[PDB]
Design a protein around this motif. Structure first.
Motif: not given
Ligand SMILES: CCCCCCCCCCCCCCCCCC(=O)OC[C@H](COP(=O)([O-])OCC(O)COP(=O)([O-])OC[C@@H](COC(=O)CCCCCCCCCCCCCCCCC)OC(=O)CCCCCCCCCCCCCCCCC)OC(=O)CCCCCCCCCCCCCCCCC
Ligand SMILES: CCCCCCCCCCCCCCCCCC(=O)OC[C@H](COP(=O)([O-])OCC(O)COP(=O)([O-])OC[C@@H](COC(=O)CCCCCCCCCCCCCCCCC)OC(=O)CCCCCCCCCCCCCCCCC)OC(=O)CCCCCCCCCCCCCCCCC
Ligand SMILES: CCCCCCCCCCC(CCCCCCCCCC)(CO[C@H]1O[C@@H](CO)[C@H](O[C@@H]2O[C@@H](CO)[C@H](O)[C@@H](O)[C@@H]2O)[C@@H](O)[C@@H]1O)CO[C@H]1O[C@@H](CO)[C@H](O[C@@H]2O[C@@H](CO)[C@H](O)[C@@H](O)[C@@H]2O)[C@@H](O)[C@H]1O
Ligand SMILES: CCCCCCCCCCC(CCCCCCCCCC)(CO[C@H]1O[C@@H](CO)[C@H](O[C@@H]2O[C@@H](CO)[C@H](O)[C@@H](O)[C@@H]2O)[C@@H](O)[C@@H]1O)CO[C@H]1O[C@@H](CO)[C@H](O[C@@H]2O[C@@H](CO)[C@H](O)[C@@H](O)[C@@H]2O)[C@@H](O)[C@H]1O
Ligand SMILES: CCCCCCCCCCCCCCCCCC(=O)OC[C@H](COP(=O)([O-])OCC[N+](C)(C)C)OC(=O)CCCCCCCCCCCCCCCCC
Ligand SMILES: CCCCCCCCCCCCCCCCCC(=O)OC[C@H](COP(=O)([O-])OCC[N+](C)(C)C)OC(=O)CCCCCCCCCCCCCCCCC
Ligand SMILES: CCCCCCCCCCCCCCCCCC(=O)OC[C@H](COP(=O)([O-])OCC[N+](C)(C)C)OC(=O)CCCCCCCCCCCCCCCCC
Ligand SMILES: CCCCCCCCCCCCCCCCCC(=O)OC[C@H](COP(=O)(O)OCCN)OC(=O)CCCCCCCCCCCCCCCCC
Ligand SMILES: CCCCCCCCCCCCCCCCCC(=O)OC[C@H](COP(=O)(O)OCCN)OC(=O)CCCCCCCCCCCCCCCCC
Lengths: 558, 88, 186, 494, 81
Positions: A164, A173, A176-177
């Motif tokens: 992220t 993002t 990463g999430l």
């Protein structure tokens, strides 16, 4: 040393917001990991299955130390991408020792070297990487249930933050999430696994559980059913993180979504540390006598996973057009070979498991370097393909498609041959190193009666060789869709380079064009060494293979 | 017995959740809570201070996880604009 | 002797039970509201094939064993052969039945003749050093052992081939072997 | 230093020489072919020195080198009776293969020359290594250079052909590899001298036989597994086709002399009826289809499948006549197959751009020299006497018949059926009318290049047809070692 | 024939060759010729180091193979009792 290096680097990082410091903070981290190598090298003069350290919480083994050093080298090699600029300007007028050590070359390098690129502007990037190494190395050394949980978290959380750290990328993002969420599910399985162990056995020591397990191996009120199926839940949480099927779905998406310099470190280090930790567990929990406990071994998940990782990895990779989705499915088929060697627990299979893990980690790293270098070479090249115009986050993943590599052998032939040798080494073709790795695991499995899994693996490989050959077919068989940039090679626009001497005095001024712009040496040397290790392994196999012969003898002796 | 019941709520509230990612991140917090409860209840039965010590360290890392989660969630929201999970 | 009809239902309940949850997972991932009772509305066929393939693998596998009263690798091949042949009948196509009977038939012959390690492998219980040493240095074997293996003749003409060959021919064709003197003298 | 390692390195000098000249002298593409051609002639010279020193009556492997530096995978080299003529054949063919594409290769001439020179080092190492793991290391190493060679210099459907040669070889070899690995776990090594004197349980021999036979039936190729050959022997460039039909096909036949005969005696003796069923069905089916083949290159390619069955039946005949004739057949097949591809793939396809036999008729009116050689080559393909192809077929067929009469008889139909497609191809192209009327432009005859690569190839098949003692003499003593059996009055003499 | 030192000297030379090929820079440029003794010299330095660790690995397996026989030899001795 790794902890002093994190704290010291963090104190310097915390009093600067200068983004120009990122390159030098990465160069100091490579110096720091080299001291860690010097220290774990000094610690290697003892023969022992294990020595309890720090109140029993940690342990050291010859296998534990050889693996920390390997993690440290791999980390130094990956850290090079953020430590040196991708491109370079080279002239014969600046090529001698006196030139390099006593002359200077002035020219406008801001655009040629991508000085202000995203990989060169994240101040905290080496720091978060050092924390993942800190967690990786601590896990190999963990001797307690509580130590395992904290170490896997310290490794995992840093991989979420690295996934992220490109915060202006909607693709990072997202990657990463997904990774944080599904890895948090993975850790809840690991915590349940440890929690059931301490609750039924009263102990957090791995050394105490191995003793209870060895007594219970005989040949009425407290049958130790908990060990095999507490370890099963514990094991599933680690099959997620190595992305072994059927817990593999996240890795193609995350690896494809995050930037490629990042996906290099995130797709390699977790596997080395997690597989070494599982190896000691599998050796100390094997019931030599056949027993009711043997019928329920937690290690059958590993065979089921290796079985599934072979079919899933090669088949789903058949119709992948994205190079990062292809590289991740190739990993899921290689972790099947790793799992198969880890599940047959024998001297020959432990040698095979140790050899395969090191060679695949250097080979998968070569694959990433060639990929990253190919997309930094396209700087003096131009394309007119609508698909290559419709891609997203082209700065973070310059090469996203297999077709983007069409005709690369006509743009740079040796880098294309380097990728061919690496891919052919993933296939398992002799006399490359990957063939020998695959043969060692097949020899061990055939010896121990796993004839059916050997047959799965050989049929699986021919299927996986199909999509490896489509990559090479793309490199060699068609023509480039990329063209030399017409203005960078126009014979009318040339930048001025100027060569000065040891004390700010001009020697010679030069006018240079785009043909004087090359890959920076640290990446071409790194690709060159790994390619030649892969190529010429048969003439240089004695010390590497013997290192694994001795470690297995220590683990299985006494 | 409340340990299993709580652990099943957090597992399905994570897997069967079709609302938003903060509720995803909440359900992890529930699962860890149930595991800590199992460890705390066993440690009282076995006269062990180590289980309470283990519990306290699962609280500290469960808060570290939820801070890293909320930080990543903000990053994702700034770019996507919705942390709602979409079905159909 | 095993109760194939009693066994097969147990074989159907196990495998068919797995298809029940794969059906439930299909209902959950549906994008349209159909209701909880949809598990047997559309997903019933998925569990039925799981139910059908399972017990059809067990009854035939059991019924094969009761036919000749011996336990070996091949029985699982027949039951697997049928279980695959059952898979095609859902699709309704002769190539699929044969393509399926071939696949899962051969899979469950191979793993039963080789002992798939998914439940461990046979324990050595013996000196592994000795077993390898014995298989490597037993370089000469008694002539009887090869003769039992490859027979006699086709170039395996041991001392005494001709003395016994004359007797063997006599007992079958009733002809006394006596090669011609083939010489004016003697 | 061993002469055998001289054989393996000279092509590496050529590769290194070829790749660095551009750093020394826009060097002309003519120079790199000059280096590549000379490098192969040097290998031929060394292999000829080795034959002039070779002893025809010695069991010990000759021209070995002391190592005393044992690692886990060392490379040992040896030359005995069975493997020397295979080495001799490779060093004779490779210069001719480069000359056959002297003009046909235009782009990536460096790449083509480097692959073939690499391809030569790998092919010699197969017949020279002294253990079975080394045998496999070099019999599968040819796949990447062959894959890239086909898809870089191939015909229109080269992509399909390159994928077929790589994925059939890899699969068959993996079944072979599982057998080689089982042997090494029993014997503890693979070195020929140690491994040959080990015996094996009958069941082990049967299961070891399969895997190896799966592997050699793919690489023979026997009918029903032969689709990779029709694609990769046609779509390949002419030099690659020559190497793939004169050298690569013969690694499996030699692999019977190291991997099946001496270490699986019982298994072979009991499984011959499978092999002869496959072999006779192969001869019978591979002859009828090549009778109906329209691609001129595919007809020549698929007649190799017909002949490779005859010498495959000769190595499983347990007869000193069959085994020797089998080597002679695979030696003569290399000359005649090489020439026929030169005739079809090199002389017709270069001039016409097509390989459809529909477009060819009565070339004898315009190409007297080509018609001449294309007639001796067609006679050799038909096993006509005065040709070493005939001696190999005759000696293999006697061995096949003497071992299993019905199979040798069903193999003996090859005399009828090989002449059927070899002369039907000859009368359609050379004869059968004045000239094909699709030629809107008259054709030049053989050039001097074409006239000399064919003159060599038919010279070898003819000279060794009048006097096959040149090959038969050095084959006798060492091939005696690969027979299995005893006579009642000559066994166990005391 | 594989001398541990001559190979790694040759190995270092080929890294420099492969480097320049990947970089697409001319081999055997005159002012840069020093890199071949340097890459070649470093390779030899590695080869000396490998040679040393090879001596240490021969001993450890030599001790182990003795230790296996001794473990095995005294095991059967108690069986004959
Ligand atoms: C020195 C004092 C100083 O520089 O303060 C001025 C500094 C700002 O001055 P500046 O003019 O902006 O600095 C010039 C540049 O920024 C450049 O400043 P700098 O980066 O060169 O110096 C910052 C300084 C900051 O670090 C320190 O001062 C060490 C105390 O030192 C470093 O970061 C580099 C060496 C780090 C040593 C790390 C040792 C930590 C122990 C690790 C485990 C040991 C076992 O402000 C600080 O407070 C830095 C000191 C950190 C205070 C933390 C104290 C809490 C300790 C827990
Ligand atoms: C296994 C194999 C084992 C080894 C076998 C032999 C094969 C390797 C042979 C040696 C190759 C590397 C060494 C030569 C080298 O780097 O020359 C580059 C270069 C030649 O290339 P070039 O393109 O002509 O350079 C001009 C360009 O403008 C240059 O422009 P630029 O900006 O691109 O230059 C960047 C430069 C700037 O860098 C520097 O300034 C160099 C800093 C050196 C620090 C030395 C520290 C010494 C103490 C260390 C700790 C104790 C040990 O960085 C480098 O060139 C370093 C590249 C390093 C690549 C990776 C090598 C290590 C990893 C190996 C991978 C293994 C993978 C498989 C195994 C995996 C694990 C088992 O020469 C120099 O830079 C001259 C200085 C050479 C080093 C210093 C010597 C004098 C020291 C003072 C007296
Ligand atoms: C690229 C392919 C070829 C590579 C071949 C080399 C591989 C084998 C090398 C094995 C290796 C390096 C570990 C590196 C691990 C890297 C990651 C994994 C390997 C990836 C390829 C570990 O050596 C270990 O080997 C194990 C088995 O081999 C043994 O078990 C250990 O006891 C042993 O220490 C050898 O290290 C050696 O370092 C030297 C000092 O330089 C040590 O000598 C001594 O050290 C101090 C007194 O102690 C003194 O101060 C020093 O003066 C003295 O001399 C040796 O004693 C040894 O420690
Ligand atoms: C799609 C085709 C699927 C066909 C699968 C065939 C699987 C055959 C097992 C492979 C194999 C070598 C072949 C390796 C390379 C060849 C590649 C093989 C794949 C074929 C292409 C294992 O090889 C190992 O087997 C070890 C013994 O287990 C021995 O040690 C060695 O023979 C060897 O190490 C065969 O070894 C054999 O040893 C014998 C005991 O002497 C085993 O018992 C046999 O069967 C019993 C009834 O069950 C009966 O009592 C009896 O008949 C016999 O005692 C066999 O079961 C088999 O194991
Ligand atoms: C490759 C394995 C690492 C290695 O080279 O070990 C040698 C060296 C061994 O060094 P060393 O411990 O032998 O240092 C010399 C000690 N005396 C003088 C007593 C002999 O490993 C290292 O410590 C190098 C540290 C940096 C490694 C960074 C990778 C480049
Ligand atoms: C008795 C045991 C021994 C006998 C084994 C019995 C099996 C023998 C038959 C299989 C042997 C291997 C040959 C497979 C060749 C397939 C290559 C091919 O056709 O695709 C080329 C093609 C090349 O394309 P193309 O030239 O065919 O036309 C399309 C052009 N493109 C794709 C560019 C638009 O490559 C592909 O992309 C196809 C991918 C499909 C995956 C193929 C799976 C089969 C591979 C074998 C593994 C299966 C188990 C073994
Ligand atoms: C050595 C044998 C003696 C010579 C044999 C005939 C050679 C004559 C050469 C010739 O006529 O020029 C080509 C002739 C020249 O013909 P031409 O003389 O009519 O030339 C003018 C006509 N044009 C130009 C149209 C051709 O070419 C042909 O017409 C046909 C070519 C094929 C003929 C091949 C001859 C057979 C060669 C081998 C025969 C030996 C078989 C062995 C028997 C089996 C052994 C058991
Ligand atoms: C031998 C062991 C290897 C296992 C082989 C198992 C075969 C599996 C292949 C399969 O799934 O069957 C499908 C195949 C294709 O059938 P089809 O649907 O009609 O395709 C249309 C073509 N016109 O069906 C077939 O074509 C198979 C027909 C031959 C079966 C011989 C038995
Ligand atoms: C050992 C294998 C050696 C591989 C080739 C070694 C020499 C080499 O790298 O050749 C360099 C050459 C560059 O030549 P260039 O001036 O670009 O002309 C166009 C041809 N590509 O580029 C080439 O010709 C490289 C390709 C050669 C063929 C590779 C064969 C690999 C098979 C495995």
């Amino acid at each position: 040393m790794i902890m002093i290096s994190i704290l010291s680097l963090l104190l310097s990082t915390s009093v600067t917001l200068r983004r120009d410091m990122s390159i030098l903070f990465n160069r100091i981290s490579i110096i720091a990991l080299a001291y860690c190598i010097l220290h774990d090298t000094m610690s290697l003069s003892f023969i022992s299955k294990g020595i309890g350290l720090h109140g029993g919480l940690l342990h050291i083994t010859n296998l534990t130390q050889i693996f920390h050093i390997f993690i440290f080298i791999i980390s130094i090699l990956i850290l090079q991408l953020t430590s040196f600029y991708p491109r370079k300007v080279w002239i014969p007028e600046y090529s001698s020792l006196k030139d390099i050590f006593f002359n200077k070359i002035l020219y406008y390098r801001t655009k040629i070297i991508n000085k202000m690129g995203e990989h060169m502007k994240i101040i905290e990037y080496p720091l978060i990487l050092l924390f993942v190494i800190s967690g990786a190395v601590f896990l190999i050394s963990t001797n307690d249930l509580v130590s395992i949980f904290l170490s896997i978290e310290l490794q995992s959380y840093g991989l979420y933050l690295l996934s992220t750290i490109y915060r202006n990328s909607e693709l990072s993002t997202t990657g990463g999430l997904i990774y944080f969420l599904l890895g948090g599910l993975s850790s809840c399985f690991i915590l349940l696994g440890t929690s059931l162990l301490y609750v039924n056995s009263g102990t957090t020591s791995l050394d105490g559980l191995y003793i209870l397990n060895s007594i219970s191996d005989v040949n009425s009120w407290y049958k130790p059913y908990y060990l095999n199926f507490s370890l099963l839940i514990f094991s599933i949480g680690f099959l997620f993180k190595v992305s072994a099927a059927p817990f593999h779905f996240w890795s193609p998406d995350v690896y494809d979504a995050i930037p490629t310099i990042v996906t290099t470190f995130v797709a390699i280090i977790a596997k080395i540390s997690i597989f070494i930790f599982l190896l000691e567990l599998v050796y100390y929990t094997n019931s030599n006598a056949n027993s009711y406990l043997s019928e329920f071994s937690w290690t059958y998940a590993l065979l089921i996973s290796s079985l599934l990782s072979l079919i899933i990895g090669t088949v789903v990779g058949l119709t992948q057009f994205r190079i990062k989705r292809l590289l991740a499915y190739s990993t899921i088929s290689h972790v099947g070979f790793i799992l198969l060697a880890l599940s047959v627990s024998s001297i020959e299979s432990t040698q095979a498991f140790i050899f395969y893990l090191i060679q695949y980690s250097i080979s998968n790293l070569n694959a990433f370097f060639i990929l990253i270098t190919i997309g930094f070479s396209l700087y003096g090249y131009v394309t007119n393909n609508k698909e290559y115009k419709s891609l997203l986050d082209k700065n973070n993943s310059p090469i996203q498609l297999i077709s983007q590599l069409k005709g690369y052998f006509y743009i740079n032939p040796l880098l294309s041959l380097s990728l061919a040798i690496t891919i052919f080494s993933f296939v398992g073709v002799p006399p490359l190193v990957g063939f020998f790795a695959k043969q060692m695991v097949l020899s061990a499995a055939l010896d121990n009666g796993y004839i059916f899994l050997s047959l799965i693996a050989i049929i699986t490989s021919v299927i996986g060789a199909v999509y490896y050959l489509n990559v090479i077919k793309e490199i060699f068989f068609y023509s480039p869709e990329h063209e030399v940039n017409p203005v960078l090679n126009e014979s009318d626009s040339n930048f001025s380079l100027r060569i000065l001497n040891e004390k700010n005095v001009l020697i010679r001024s030069v006018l240079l064009k785009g043909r004087n712009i090359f890959i920076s040496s640290p990446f071409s040397i790194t690709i060159s060494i790994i390619t030649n290790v892969i190529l010429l392994f048969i003439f240089m196999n004695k010390e590497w293979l013997s290192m694994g012969t001795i470690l297995v003898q220590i683990l299985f002796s006494a | 017995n409340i340990t299993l019941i709580l652990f099943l709520i957090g597992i399905l509230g994570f897997v069967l959740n079709r609302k938003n990612i903060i509720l995803m991140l909440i359900s992890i917090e529930i699962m860890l809570l149930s595991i800590t409860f199992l460890i705390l209840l066993s440690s009282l039965n076995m006269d062990d201070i180590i289980g309470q010590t283990y519990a306290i360290y699962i609280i500290v890392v469960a808060g570290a996880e939820s801070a890293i989660g909320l930080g990543i969630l903000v990053a994702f929201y700034r770019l996507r604009g919705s942390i709602a999970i979409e079905y159909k | 002797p095993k109760d194939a009809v009693h066994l097969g239902l147990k074989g159907a309940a196990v495998v068919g039970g797995i298809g029940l949850l794969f059906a439930a997972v299909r209902t959950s991932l549906a994008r349209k509201n159909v209701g909880p009772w949809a598990i047997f509305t559309r997903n019933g066929k998925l569990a039925a094939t799981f139910a059908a393939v399972g017990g059809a693998y067990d009854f035939t596998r059991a019924a094969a064993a009761n036919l000749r009263e011996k336990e070996d690798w091949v029985n699982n091949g027949i039951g697997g052969l049928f279980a695959g042949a059952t898979m095609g009948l859902t699709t309704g196509r002769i190539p699929r039945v044969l393509g399926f009977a071939a696949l899962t038939g051969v899979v469950l012959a191979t793993a039963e003749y080789a002992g798939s390690g998914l439940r461990g492998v046979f324990k050595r219980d013996v000196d592994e050093y000795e077993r390898k040493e014995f298989l490597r240095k037993n370089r000469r074997r008694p002539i009887e052992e090869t003769l039992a293996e490859i027979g006699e003749g086709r170039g395996i003409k041991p001392p005494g081939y001709y003395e016994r060959r004359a007797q063997r021919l006599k007992e079958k064709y009733g002809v006394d072997i006596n090669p011609v003197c083939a010489d004016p003298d003697q | 230093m061993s002469l055998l390692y001289v054989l393996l390195i000279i092509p590496i000098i050529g590769i290194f020489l070829i790749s660095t000249i551009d750093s020394f002298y826009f060097f002309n593409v003519s120079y790199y072919k000059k280096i590549a051609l000379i490098t192969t002639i040097l290998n031929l010279i060394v292999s000829l020195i080795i034959y002039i020193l070779f002893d025809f009556s010695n069991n010990q492997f000759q021209f070995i080198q002391e190592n005393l530096d044992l690692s886990f995978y060392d490379i040992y080299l040896g030359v005995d009776g069975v493997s020397i003529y295979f080495v001799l054949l490779t060093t004779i063919i490779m210069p001719i293969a480069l000359v056959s594409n002297w003009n046909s290769i235009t782009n990536n001439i460096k790449s083509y020359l480097i692959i073939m020179l690499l391809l030569e080092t790998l092919l010699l190492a197969v017949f020279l290594v002294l253990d079975v793991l080394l045998f496999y290391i070099f019999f599968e190493s040819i796949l990447p250079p062959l894959f890239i060679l086909i898809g870089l210099f191939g015909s229109s459907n080269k992509v399909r052909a390159s994928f077929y040669i790589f994925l059939y070889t890899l699969l068959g070899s993996l079944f072979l590899l599982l057998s080689i690995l089982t042997m090494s776990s029993i014997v503890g090594t693979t070195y020929f001298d140690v491994l040959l004197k080990s015996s094996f349980e009958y069941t082990t021999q049967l299961f070891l036989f399969f895997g190896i036979f799966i592997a050699f039936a793919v690489k023979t190729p026997v009918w029903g597994l032969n689709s990779w050959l029709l694609r990769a022997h046609v779509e390949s460039p002419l030099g690659g086709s020559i190497v793939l039909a004169a050298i690569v096909l013969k690694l499996s036949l030699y692999g019977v002399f190291r991997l099946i005969l001496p270490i699986l005696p019982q298994a072979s003796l009991n499984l011959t009826y499978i092999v002869y069923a496959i072999g006779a069905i192969t001869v019978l089916y591979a002859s009828f289809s090549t009778l109906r083949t329209v691609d001129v290159k595919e007809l020549i390619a698929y007649s190799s499948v017909a002949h490779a069955a005859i010498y495959l039946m000769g190595v499983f005949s347990n007869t000193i006549q069959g085994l020797e004739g089998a080597i002679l057949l695979g030696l003569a097949h290399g000359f005649v197959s090489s020439g026929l591809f030169i005739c079809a793939g090199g002389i017709l396809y270069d001039r016409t751009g097509t390989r459809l036999i529909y477009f060819f008729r009565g070339l004898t009116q315009i190409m007297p020299l080509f018609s001449l050689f294309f007639f001796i080559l067609c006679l050799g393909n038909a096993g006509t006497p005065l040709t070493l192809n005939f001696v190999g077929e005759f000696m293999s067929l006697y061995g096949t018949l003497e071992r299993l009469p019905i199979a040798g008889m069903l193999a003996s139909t090859s005399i009828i059926f090989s002449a059927a497609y070899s002369i039907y191809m000859y009368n359609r192209i050379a004869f059968g009318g004045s000239v094909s009327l699709y030629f809107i432009d008259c054709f030049r005859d053989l050039t001097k290049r074409e006239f000399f690569i064919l003159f060599t190839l038919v010279s070898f098949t003819v000279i060794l047809g009048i006097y096959p003692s040149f090959v038969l003499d050095g084959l006798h003593y060492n091939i005696s070692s690969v027979v299995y059996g005893i006579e009642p009055n000559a066994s166990y003499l005391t | 024939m594989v001398n541990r030192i001559l190979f790694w000297t040759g190995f270092g030379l080929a890294v420099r060759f492969w480097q320049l090929g990947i970089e697409m820079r001319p081999f055997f440029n005159r002012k840069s010729l020093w890199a071949y003794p340097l890459f070649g010299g470093v390779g030899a330095s590695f080869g000396y180091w490998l040679q040393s660790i090879d001596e240490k690995q021969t001993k450890m397996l030599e001790e182990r193979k003795q230790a296996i026989l001794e473990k095995r030899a005294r095991r059967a001795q108690r069986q004959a009792e």
